[PDB]
Amino acid sequence: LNQDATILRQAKLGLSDPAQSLSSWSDNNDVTPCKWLGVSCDATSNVVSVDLSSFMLVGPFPSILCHLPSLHSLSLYNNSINGSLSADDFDTCHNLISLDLSENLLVGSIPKSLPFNLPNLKFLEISGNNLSDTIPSSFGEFRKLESLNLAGNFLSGTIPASLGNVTTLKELKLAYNLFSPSQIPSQLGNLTELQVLWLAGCNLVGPIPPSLSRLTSLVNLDLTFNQLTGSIPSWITQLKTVEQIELFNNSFSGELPESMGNMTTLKRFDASMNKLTGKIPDNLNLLNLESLNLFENMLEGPLPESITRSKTLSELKLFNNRLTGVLPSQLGANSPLQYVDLSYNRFSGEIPANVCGEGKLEYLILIDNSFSGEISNNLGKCKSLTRVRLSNNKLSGQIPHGFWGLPRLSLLELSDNSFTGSIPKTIIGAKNLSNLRISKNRFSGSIPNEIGSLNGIIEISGAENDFSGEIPESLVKLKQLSRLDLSKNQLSGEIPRELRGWKNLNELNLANNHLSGEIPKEVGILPVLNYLDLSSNQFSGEIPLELQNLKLNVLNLSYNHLSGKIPPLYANKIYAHDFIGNPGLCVDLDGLCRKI
Amino acid sequence: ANLEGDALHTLRVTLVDPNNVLQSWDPTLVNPCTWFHVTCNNENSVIRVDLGNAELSGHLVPELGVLKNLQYLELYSNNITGPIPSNLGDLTNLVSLDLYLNSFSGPIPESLGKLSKLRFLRLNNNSLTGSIPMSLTQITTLQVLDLSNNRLSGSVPDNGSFSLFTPISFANNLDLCGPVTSHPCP
């Protein structure tokens, strides 16, 4: 069926095909090339493109495929095409418009003669290969090229200035290459049709060139993971169609440009992990803003109210700054807030009452601020929450009952506040809860028995509270519990005798309570218990001999009412500080038992 | 935080984890202090790694030595193979090294003598070979030692911290000699 059938089969001969992805090709039934897998034709039965994406093909680049006279697109995306490219590989390919060689095992240099050989190329991708040497300056001779992606190679030297000559470019992607330290070439400002500029991990230094103000039709500007310096220039405001700006992991300093507020097209802005100072610009009118990340800078002053005009805002991460004042009271009321992290700032006042106004809030992370007042009733209705961290604030009052029973809540960290009240029965609802952190509060009443029905709990940490009553017997039903710290409370009574359920319990800390009775013998058969603190209690009876089976790192039974002989392995001088303040304990020397 | 989280993540990639005990070890977290099986001090620095009896296999990584405030390293009752990394001796605040009940091979590294605060050393039930490093006698704090059920050989030292240890610390080894064993040395 014509030379197209012949040429395709020769190309298949040169490649190893372990998955038999091309079994339609070399498997006859008189079928013509146009219905073979990956091969597409025009109306006159000429092979116009070949797409062999993700076929697990191994071997050198099949240059014979360009003997197809009508070939316009060639995609070998995501295979194991190996070896290097040469000038000879692209001699006959002068009709190609599109060439995708990305995600292969190509090594060596990009042939210098490529633009001369491929005059009609609009799309060139050789991303995610192992290419080395410099980007040829001959690439300035490309007359029609609209997209160039060489990202994720080991290309060296510097980004050639001659790429500014290729004014047909809409996308320039050179990210994650092994370039020498250098400034962004000034000539890239000539590329006035550029929509995408992705020079992340390109070892760039110095300021962003003023030339780049002329890139007025930019959609996505990503310069992440370099060492760029100076201010984030105020001419980013003049990018009329810009949707994404990614500047994180650089050495940018100075203020965010005050003119930023009127960038109505901006969806995603991230200048995190820089050295930014001054205030977040006010009078914001960011109608299309989905994501604002400015974390790990030295930003000061408030979060302006006008952030609430961004009604499509889902991500707001300002953590690790010097931000002060009250949050906008209406934040989250009329936007689909999803990820909020304002940790490690100096925010004061109330947590906004309708922060989960649209029922999308997953992360509420407010660590180490001065948030005062209470958690509102409306956060109890926020059934999308998975990660809540409110610790080290000035929060107080009772937690709403529905908040404890949130069905997807995984990490609940309320620690180091002044929360009051008892943990309610409604905590049965929290079926994904794996990490409960409520230490250093004023929680009271009994630990409710309903915590024991939450099979997936791994940590319970509620030290330094006013919990009273017994330890629920149902806490032993928790098979995956690895830490229990209920130390420094008013708990009373004894601990359950049947403990084999605690097969994962690594740490048990019940110190500084009013606990009584015997230390259960089954404590000695817990498979992974390495930290046992039962000190400052009223435990009586003998220290079980079964405790000798444990390989403890911390063992502390000090300040109890224990008596009788110390188990012989622990009578050794080296363990003596573990049993201080137990007058009735003795060291047996076979016959004589002495109180030491 | 950043550096410690990256070390522990490098460990995760290198271990085999059929029961997904390292599910929570999310590398996008600022620090590993909310991760399961990890404990941090008040300054958000790792002080415990508790991964005993977790059906882990593969081998340990040398990047573990960046955990400068680590006090307790529990990796016992797994099926971990390969050598004990030499730069576990960089863990200057380590109190307990519990690698027992695994398939560790090769020597006990000489570098473990630089663990000046080590109290518990339990390497029993492995396939460790070679001799017991003398440098271990110079750990003044060392009070609990179990090298039993290994393939160790040569002289067992009995000075310094080793003066406290009975035959049960060294039982069922390949070819050990000295006063604490019944056999004097070759």
């Binding site: 995501n78 994720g152 990614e246 991230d270 953590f319 | 996008t28 620090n31």
Partner: peptide
């Protein structure tokens, strides 16, 4: 297959 980090916002949090 070389996983090239996407052109997207940093996912760091806490």
């Amino acid at each position: 297959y070389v996983p090239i980090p996407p052109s997207a916002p940093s996912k760091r949090h806490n």
